[PDB]
Design an enzyme around this catalytic site. Structure first.
Site, PDB file in Angstrom:
ATOM      1  N   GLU A  99       0.827  -1.186   0.000  1.00  0.00           N
ATOM      2  CA  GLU A  99       0.000   0.000   0.000  1.00  0.00           C
ATOM      3  C   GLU A  99       0.872   1.251   0.000  1.00  0.00           C
ATOM      4  O   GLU A  99       1.833   1.351   0.759  1.00  0.00           O
ATOM      5  CB  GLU A  99      -0.914  -0.023   1.220  1.00  0.00           C
ATOM      6  CG  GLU A  99      -1.828   1.180   1.357  1.00  0.00           C
ATOM      7  CD  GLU A  99      -2.714   1.100   2.582  1.00  0.00           C
ATOM      8  OE1 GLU A  99      -2.863   0.004   3.176  1.00  0.00           O
ATOM      9  OE2 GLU A  99      -3.266   2.154   2.955  1.00  0.00           O
ATOM     10  N   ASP A 107       0.261   5.171   0.451  1.00  0.00           N
ATOM     11  CA  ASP A 107      -0.716   6.189   0.833  1.00  0.00           C
ATOM     12  C   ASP A 107      -0.247   7.547   0.347  1.00  0.00           C
ATOM     13  O   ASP A 107       0.718   8.115   0.865  1.00  0.00           O
ATOM     14  CB  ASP A 107      -0.935   6.206   2.342  1.00  0.00           C
ATOM     15  CG  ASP A 107      -1.536   4.910   2.859  1.00  0.00           C
ATOM     16  OD1 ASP A 107      -2.336   4.281   2.126  1.00  0.00           O
ATOM     17  OD2 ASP A 107      -1.231   4.538   4.010  1.00  0.00           O
ATOM     18  N   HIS A 117       3.867   1.506   2.751  1.00  0.00           N
ATOM     19  CA  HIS A 117       3.648   0.237   3.445  1.00  0.00           C
ATOM     20  C   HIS A 117       4.065  -0.954   2.554  1.00  0.00           C
ATOM     21  O   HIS A 117       3.231  -1.517   1.832  1.00  0.00           O
ATOM     22  CB  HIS A 117       2.177   0.012   3.791  1.00  0.00           C
ATOM     23  CG  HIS A 117       1.544   1.058   4.659  1.00  0.00           C
ATOM     24  ND1 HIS A 117       1.393   0.907   6.019  1.00  0.00           N
ATOM     25  CD2 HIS A 117       0.908   2.210   4.340  1.00  0.00           C
ATOM     26  CE1 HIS A 117       0.735   1.946   6.506  1.00  0.00           C
ATOM     27  NE2 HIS A 117       0.420   2.746   5.507  1.00  0.00           N
TER      28      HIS A 117
END
Length: 442
Positions: free
Chosen positions: A214, A216, A230
């Protein structure tokens, strides 16, 4: 999931720009699809709900396999986007209403490509991704998020033949939290050991979680904002159970396959409290729209290099605004995400560097190289009340201890039952999305 026959699936058209040089872009005729969690789940040959409120029907879904055979997810027609789900598009702007009154709370959506049959996959290394945002109506406890995840382009259809809808029905969601609240994982209902979430009339948690890398770009409201990497080992969509999910509730946050904290650059947490906020004397005024620019720098300046740096700047009313800097005695004034910044700041904060354990910026980059799906969402937080984003976390921590204070919100803020009343009409807008080489999007 099987696909139901009660309503056609009609994603919202959303043009983005693909750019080759500053002010030289072409339109890409993409679209927005609703995540399968928000869809009506009912019997394949009828109208009977397989899921109501926060529970699966135990007669229809005694096992995941039986549930999957008996049940189907249905389409979102155009009329229902605004009326039911609070989603709308005007030109190149996408709007997501938080509460839509039969009462819908939050939304998660994905960008489809021009065929409307696959997610638009973004290969982000050595590229720049840019958009305009309005979070002026989002206060403490809410998050209007824009981010990328390592979903499959077909939502898993090729891997899991029981998934009939694929990307067209917003299936295959995974993220670095390895969430158990995903209703359909690996083509199957996640109905085993399903448990309602107390105080959440719409959601529960199943036996499995769904993990993947991920990136962000934007976790934010008008009070605080962050961008965060992540990585996971591996990065690709992985159904998890037991310790691999890294469940918070069993003390496994740092024992799973994903870096749950991520390496964050959050201006306020990095000790610049005057950079971003709701007023004209903050450097970046969150009461008005602004442009968010993200640059993904590699080791050799090519698409084949390792990911080394996530750079950020803003544009508001034609004024270029460089990122804030880390502001602690004896710490370098970093203004971007790098491995060194992550090690130094987590060292200061006393946070375990799970980012590094998961392979760091290099591993994050491998996900970005394969291509990631774009997610746009609005949500409140039933676990931690968004205190991690915009308040003191932990709430009992000393706000003068580096890492504790992430925003000015009170530690009593963000209770879902309260924010769902007080901020019912909050709307996040994401618009004028632009993607291209570094330096091409403004």
């Amino acid at each position: 999931q099987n696909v139901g026959t009660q309503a056609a699936e009609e994603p919202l058209n959303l043009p983005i720009s693909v750019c080759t040089a500053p002010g030289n872009c072409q339109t890409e005729a993409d679209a927005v699809v609703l995540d399968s969690n928000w869809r009506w789940a009912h019997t394949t040959t009828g109208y009977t709900n397989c899921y109501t409120g926060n529970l699966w029907d135990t007669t229809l879904c005694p096992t995941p396999e039986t549930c999957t055979t008996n049940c189907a997810i249905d389409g979102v027609p155009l009329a229902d986007w605004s009326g039911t789900y609070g989603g709308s598009v005007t030109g190149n702007k996408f709007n997501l209403k938080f509460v839509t009154v039969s009462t819908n709370i939050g939304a998660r959506t994905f960008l489809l490509d021009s065929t409307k049959t696959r997610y638009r996959m973004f290969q982000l290394l050595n590229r720049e991704f840019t958009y305009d945002v309005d979070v002026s109506s989002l206060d403490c406890g809410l998050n209007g998020a824009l981010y990328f995840v390592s979903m499959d382009a077909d939502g898993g259809a090729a891997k899991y033949p029981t998934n009939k809808g694929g990307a067209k029905y917003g299936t295959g969601y995974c993220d670095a939290q390895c969430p158990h609240d995903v209703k359909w994982i690996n083509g199957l209902a996640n109905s085993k050991d399903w448990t309602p979430i107390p105080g959440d009339a719409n959601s529960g948690k199943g036996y499995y979680g769904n993990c993947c890398a991920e990136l962000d770009i934007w976790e934010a409201n008008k009070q605080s904002q962050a961008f965060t990497t992540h990585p996971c080992t591996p990065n690709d969509q992985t159904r998890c159970e037991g310790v691999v999910c890294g469940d918070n509730d069993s003390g496994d946050r740092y024992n799973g396959m994903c870096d749950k904290d991520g390496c964050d650059f959050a201006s306020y947490r990095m000790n610049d409290h005057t950079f971003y906020g709701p007023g004209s004397t903050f450097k970046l005024d969150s009461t008005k729209p602004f442009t968010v620019v993200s640059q993904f720098i590699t080791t050799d300046g090519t698409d084949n290099g390792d990911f080394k740096e996530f750079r950020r700047f803003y544009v508001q009313n034609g004024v270029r605004i460089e990122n804030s800097k880390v502001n602690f005695p004896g710490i370098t004034a970093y203004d971007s995400i790098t491995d060194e910044m992550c090690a130094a700041t987590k060292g200061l904060f006393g946070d375990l560097d799970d980012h590094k354990n998961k392979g760091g910026m290099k591993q994050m980059g491998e996900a970005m190289r394969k291509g990631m799906a774009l997610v746009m969402s609005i949500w409140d937080d039933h676990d931690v009340n968004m205190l991690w984003l915009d308040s003191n976390y932990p709430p009992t921590g000393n706000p003068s201890t580096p890492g504790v204070a992430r925003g000015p919100c009170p530690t009593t803020s963000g209770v879902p039952s309260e924010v769902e009343v007080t901020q019912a009409n909050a709307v996040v807008s994401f618009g004028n999305i632009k993607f291209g080489p570094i330096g091409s999007t403004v």
